[PDB]
Amino acid sequence: RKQEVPLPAVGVAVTGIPAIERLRFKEVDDEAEQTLDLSNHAADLTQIGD
DNA sequence: ATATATATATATATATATATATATATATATATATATATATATATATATATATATATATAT
């Protein structure tokens, strides 16, 4: 009951064409900490070359 | 009448053949257990499509 009968191929679906663009890489998430710093950056005082 | 010899009833001893009882060893069948490979099923992450909810907007 696992022989293969000679019935035709009808409704032949073509899909999953392996375009190399379709691959996306793993998105490993980071959860260690947060970048809260939003200081005013007062070091911006003018000191520029002559 | 006498003297001899034999026969009948019953059991025991010895031999022959049949059959059963006992034991062992073997071959066989079988059950079973294991191992391998394969297929199948479930869980998780992500992409895709469908459906619903909410809101806007036309007509009364």
> Could you tell me the two tokens for A10?
């009808």
CA A9 distance to own-chain centroid:
37
Residue type, A25: F
Enter the resolution in angstroms.
3.2
Distance (Å) from CA A47 to C1' B29? 105
> Could you tell me the two tokens for A26?
């793993």
Measured distance CA(A17)–CA(A23) in Å, rounded: 12
Q: Which alpha helices (H) appear in A1-50, and where do they start and end?
A: none
Measured distance CA(A13)–CA(A11) in Å, rounded: 6
Quickly tell me which residue has 């950056």 as its tokens. Answer: A41
Experimental method used, please?
cryo-EM
Measured distance CA(A16)–CA(A22) in Å, rounded: 10
CB-to-strand B under 7 Å, chain A 1-50: 24, 26-27
3-state secondary structure of A21: helix
